[PDB]
Amino acid sequence: DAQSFLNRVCGVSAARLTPCGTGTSTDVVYRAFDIYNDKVAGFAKFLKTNCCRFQEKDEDDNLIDSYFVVKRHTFSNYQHEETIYNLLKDCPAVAKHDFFKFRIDGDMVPHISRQRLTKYTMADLVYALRHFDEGNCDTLKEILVTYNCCDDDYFNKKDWYDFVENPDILRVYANLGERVRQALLKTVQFCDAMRNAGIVGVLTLDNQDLNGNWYDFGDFIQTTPGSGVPVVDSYYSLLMPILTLTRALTAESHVDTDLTKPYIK
Numbered sequence: 001d002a003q004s005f006l007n008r009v010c011g012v013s014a015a016r017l018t019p020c021g022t023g024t025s026t027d028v029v030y031r032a033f034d035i036y037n038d039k040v041a042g043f044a045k046f047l048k049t050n051c052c053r054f055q056e057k058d059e060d061d062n063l064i065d066s067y068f069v070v071k072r073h074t075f076s077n078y079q080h081e082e083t084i085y086n087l088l089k090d091c092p093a094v095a096k097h098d099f100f101k102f103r104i105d106g107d108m109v110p111h112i113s114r115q116r117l118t119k120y121t122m123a124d125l126v127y128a129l130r131h132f133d134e135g136n137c138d139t140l141k142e143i144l145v146t147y148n149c150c151d152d153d154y155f156n157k158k159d160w161y162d163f164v165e166n167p168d169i170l171r172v173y174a175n176l177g178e179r180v181r182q183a184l185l186k187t188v189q190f191c192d193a194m195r196n197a198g199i200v201g202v203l204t205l206d207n208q209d210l211n212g213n214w215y216d217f218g219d220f221i222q223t224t225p226g227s228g229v230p231v232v233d234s235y236y237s238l239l240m241p242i243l244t245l246t247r248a249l250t251a252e253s254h255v256d257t258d259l260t261k262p263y264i265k
């Protein structure tokens with residue numbers, strides 16, 4: 001049932017969810033995968049249709065930027081990703097998973113539910129800032145608004161994007177800095193949690209939500225503990241220009257690397 005499924009998704013973690021889907025059905029969304037496999041390669045916008053998404057609403061029943069993605073896939077992937085998560089559970093930079101098999105039509109379909117992810121992923125931010133198109137940029141306005149970078153009336157300005165006719169735009173982009181820097185830090189934690197847990201895999205941007213949590217272990221093969229290896233060639237390099245467009249390291253010139261402390265002399 002469309003309500004029993006939602007109540008199961010809520011699970012132990014007490015939350016109130018509004019289904020962005022339609023009656024326990026997959027929600028088709030247009031994202032910015034950074035993909036490479038036998039057939040397709042590149043950093044493009046694909047159309048993902050294997051994730052039933054619910055949005056959490058806090059007290060006052062206001063929708064907030066925290067979702068419950070419920071990706072459903074085959075049983076072998078279910079087992080493999082459950083074991084990989086169990087190995088990587090203890091890290092703080094890993095979105096809290098919840099694995100459960102549910103009655104849908106005629107068989108127990110296994111759903112793995114990522115809890116409290118942001119709407120977009122770091123790949124979406126990188127793509128929006130790297131493939132800018134002034135006439136069609138709705139996934140950049142939404143990111144800039146939902147994280148209080150600007151006021152949603154900044155976009156009524158005639159040139160809210162020009163770097164030469166509106167230098168103040170930089171001050172807006174810099175308001176993402178402390179949201180990017182943290183992400184970087186969390187990667188260095190997640191990478192460590194792999195190196196210690198002996199897991200070999202490729203870190204792609206489209207798996208890290210804007211908070212920083214990493215939530216996909218589909219192609220993570222495991223090896224002898226303590227001898228894992230994260231591959232971050234295509235993560236730090238695609239994310240590279242955003243570290244100076246949004247001045248991500250500007251918090252390193254404050255004593256104790258705190259944005260409230262005074263400057264280092």
Ligand SMILES: Nc1ncnc2c1ncn2[C@@H]1O[C@H](COP(=O)(O)OP(=O)(O)O)[C@@H](O)[C@H]1O
Nearest residue numbers: 048050071072073077206207215216217218219
């Ligand atoms: N055709 C497919 N149908 C359903 N699931 C797939 C398919 N191809 C790959 N997958 C699984 O989905 C993962 C990629 O999905 P993705 O869009 O990244 O969701 P997530 O970001 O939650 O991992 C792969 O690691 C694999 O386990």
Ligand SMILES: [Mg+2]
Nearest residue numbers: 206207216218
């Ligand atoms: Mg993924």
